[PDB]
A paper describes a structure:
The membrane-proximal external region (MPER) of the HIV-1 gp41 fusion protein is targeted by the most broadly reactive HIV-1 neutralizing antibodies. Here, we examine the structural and molecular mechansims of neutralization by anti-MPER bnAb, LN01, which was isolated from lymph-node-derived germinal center B cells of an elite controller and exhibits broad neutralization breadth. LN01 engages both MPER and the transmembrane (TM) region, which together form a continuous helix in complex with LN01. The tilted TM orientation allows LN01 to interact simultaneously with the peptidic component of the MPER epitope and membrane via two specific lipid binding sites of the antibody paratope.
Crystal structures of LN01 were determined in complex with MPER-TM1, in complex with MPER-TM1 and phosphatidylserine (06:0 PS), and in complex with MPER-TM2 to resolutions of 3.2 Å, 3.1 Å, and 3.9 Å, respectively. Two identical complexes of LN01/MPER-TM1 were present in the asymmetric unit. MPER-TM1 residues 671–689 adopt a slightly bent helical conformation in complex with LN01. Main contacts are mediated by polar interactions, D674 to LCDR3 T94, N677 to LCDR3 H92, T676 to HCDR3 W100h, and K683 to the carbonyls of HCDR3 F100 and S100b. Furthermore, gp41 F673 inserts into a hydrophobic pocket composed of HCDR3 W100h, HCDR1 Y35, and LCDR3 W96. In addition, numerous hydrophobic contacts include long-range interactions of HCDR3 residues, F100 and W100a, to gp41 I682, I686, and M687, thereby positioning the tip of HCDR3 close to TM residues. The overall contact interface of the Fab and MPER-TM1 spans 683 Å2. The structure also reveals the presence of a Fos-Choline-12 detergent molecule; its phosphate group interacts with LCDR1 K31 and the cation of the choline inserts into a cation box (Morita et al., 2016, Roderick et al., 2002) made up of gp41 W680 and Y681 and LCDR1 Y32 and HCDR3 Y100g. From this analysis, Kds were measured to be 160.8 nM for LN01 binding to MPER-TM1 in β-OG and 170.0 nM for interaction with MPER-TM1 in Fos-Choline-12, showing similar binding in both detergents. We conclude that the LN01 epitope extends from MPER into the TM region.
Numbering used by the authors:
A (entry chain B): 2 to 35, 35A, 35B, 36 to 82, 82A, 82B, 82C, 83 to 100, ...
B (entry chain A): 1 to 213
C (entry chain C): 671 to 689
The structure:
């Protein structure tokens, strides 16, 4: 059983924001399960947006009830969330979730818990328009060497909205990598850096490429990082 | 709505210690109380439902307890894979509500950071600004002081800092202090230096370059 | 809504199990 959530990265204020969760294990009309949407705001608070059943019945959190609708699309096995009149306070990670429906004679009747969670999907809500990042090398030098190992990276500067995804050597490099969290610059745009430590002997034989992705502006960038000879 | 509070908000522990997390509710929730595990990298994961019940594949180190308004999660022989943040949720009333979360991090032995410095990329100087990065790699504890000095003067609001989460195996942090400047100011000065103070360093450690040569 | 009802139903079911 797999749960893949999807939707837009950025939504305009007063718009309606739609997410879809594709359910990959069993049918949504399984009727042993309800399906639900739960969200986490920046600031770590968990809010439970909605409850639904194969029969069509829905539960909505009162603070949203005036403007949310959840529904099943049985033919393709998806569960949909629409959220209208959306504001900045709807910026959050949106999780799709499964919930056992225990029947009357079940040992565990009336026990309601969220037993399976998707990975989440982030939605920023902003008047501001999309903007891709610029990528600059952080080249290794003698100034970025300590003993036998050298440090190198690339700077991902001036982008909106969050998030950016960074990899090294197309995924083949995953040892000692540190891609930091973003920071909100004075401009109102975000920037981060991604850095890896490698053995200094390996410069001049091993190529180091960093791969940046920014899906809200359809940006993919591969920046090659060359050694300096300080 | 039933209000929920966990204690402590954050704690840190050595591998092997017993760790207990308390969850108090504004009403009685009569044992309809669930526990979840949140780690960066994976999807949130349930471990207990209805105060005491473990789900398949959750290790028996985890154990739940409680009644009335007061419940408690316990990690018995805490392991590297257990360091994460834990949430309690009440299933008693119509609008279901979670706690605020307890972040459990590792205690570890002191580790001094290795310091690196990066001047601005030629590509970036063409664009008209200049960012210089100071990197502090793989240290513990989290507290570290990073001061920037340009031709011996301290920089005020010139720089921004960022800090990774604790490494899963290393149990350590890394930190970037990036100082951002107009191409103007950067062309002005000569000697750019990054000074670091941290426990497990006896003397402050400085890394510096001269603009150009 | 049905959720809150199961809260009471549990006790109904106990009343039943006794008999
Ligand atoms: C870590 O363990 C040592 C053991 O002596 C203790 O003194 C110290 O207070 C602990 N620190 C934290 C952050 O748990
Ligand atoms: C019935 N309940 C499990 C929901 C709570 C009350 O159980 P108990 O307090 O009778 O053990």
């Amino acid at each position: 059983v797999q749960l893949v959530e999807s939707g837009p990265g950025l939504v305009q204020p007063w718009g309606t924001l739609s997410l879809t969760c594709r359910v990959s294990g069993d049918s949504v009309s399984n009727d042993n399960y309800y399906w639900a949407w739960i969200r986490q705001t920046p600031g770590r608070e968990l809010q439970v947006i909605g409850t639904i059943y194969y029969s069509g019945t829905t539960y909505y959190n009162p603070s949203l009830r005036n403007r949310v609708t959840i529904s099943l699309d049985k033919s393709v096995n998806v569960v949909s969330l629409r959220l209208g009149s959306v504001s900045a306070a709807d910026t959050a990670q949106y999780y799709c979730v499964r919930m056992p429906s225990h029947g009357f004679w079940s040992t565990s009747f009336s026990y309601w818990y969220f037993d399976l969670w998707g990975r989440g999907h982030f939605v920023a809500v902003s008047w501001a328009s999309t903007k891709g990042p610029s990528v600059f090398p952080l080249a290794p030098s003698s100034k970025s060497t300590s003993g036998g190992t050298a440090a190198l990276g690339c700077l991902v500067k001036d982008y909106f909205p969050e998030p950016v995804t960074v990899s090294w050597n197309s995924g083949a490099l995953t040892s000692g990598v540190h891609t930091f969290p973003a920071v909100l610059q004075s401009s109102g745009l975000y920037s981060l850096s991604s850095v890896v430590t490698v053995p200094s002997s390996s410069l001049g034989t091993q190529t180091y490429i960093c791969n940046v992705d920014h899906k809200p502006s359809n940006t993919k960038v591969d920046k090659k990082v060359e050694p300096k000879s300080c | 709505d039933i209000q929920m509070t966990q204690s402590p908000s954050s704690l840190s522990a050595s591998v092997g210690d017993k760790v207990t997390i308390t969850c108090r509710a504004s009403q009685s929730v009569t044992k309809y109380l669930n526990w979840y595990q949140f780690k960066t990298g994976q999807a949130p994961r349930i471990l207990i439902y209805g105060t005491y019940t473990l789900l398949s594949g959750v290790s028996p180190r985890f154990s739940g307890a409680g009644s009335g308004s007061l419940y408690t999660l316990t990690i018995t022989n805490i392991q590297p894979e257990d360091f994460a943040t834990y949430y309690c949720q009440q299933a008693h009333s119509t609008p279901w509500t979670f706690g605020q979360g307890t972040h459990v991090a590792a205690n570890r032995t002191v580790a001094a950071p290795s310091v690196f410095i990066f001047p601005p990329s030629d590509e970036q100087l063409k664009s008209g600004t200049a960012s210089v990065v100071c990197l502090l790699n793989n240290f513990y504890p989290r507290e570290a002081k990073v001061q920037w000095k340009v031709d011996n003067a301290l920089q005020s609001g010139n720089s921004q800092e960022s800090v990774t989460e604790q490494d899963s195996k290393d149990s350590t942090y890394s930190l970037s202090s990036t100082l951002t400047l107009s191409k103007a100011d950067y062309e002005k000065h000569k000697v750019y230096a990054c000074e670091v103070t941290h426990q497990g360093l006896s003397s402050p450690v400085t890394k510096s370059f001269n603009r150009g040569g | 809504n049905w959720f809150d009802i199961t809260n009471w139903l549990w006790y109904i079911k106990l009343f039943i199990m006794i008999v």
